[PDB]
Chains A and B, each alone.
Chain A
């Protein structure tokens, strides 16, 4: 018997394998993580991928439950500002440009994940995290 274990991970969409540490954490669970793969992939079917957090539990009598979250902002800018892998080193080379609407949605999408669950900080917040990956900005 095994009483309650809610272990949450960082499993991206695409990998349909029980490879450790998914093993030594959800073996003591009886985890239906093959249903987590085939129900969450279609959950974000509009793209069908991207790195997404998860959370899975056991109810004594083997009962899974999947809890999904939202994409990363470094990827939600490679799609936005059109990077390939990025702008090779944040302090030398720059690709596309951020202005006054793309960053808006970079903050919009990730409204309840960033830190300050308030819009009136997020924009400039990750616009500053933009210089961390090296994507330039257009300022008005």
Chain B
């Protein structure tokens, strides 16, 4: 299981949501991780791929 890229913590449980999709990297990359799940909740500050990259609605209060 890979991950959704930048901004991780994960340590060793997380419930990494086995997903699915290799690339030209890590002879596997099948069954990814999701953030949000039971751990990770995305990049500390993300402004796009918040469909996996955790972050809710950047409510910058202004």
Do A and B touch (CB < 8 Å)?
no
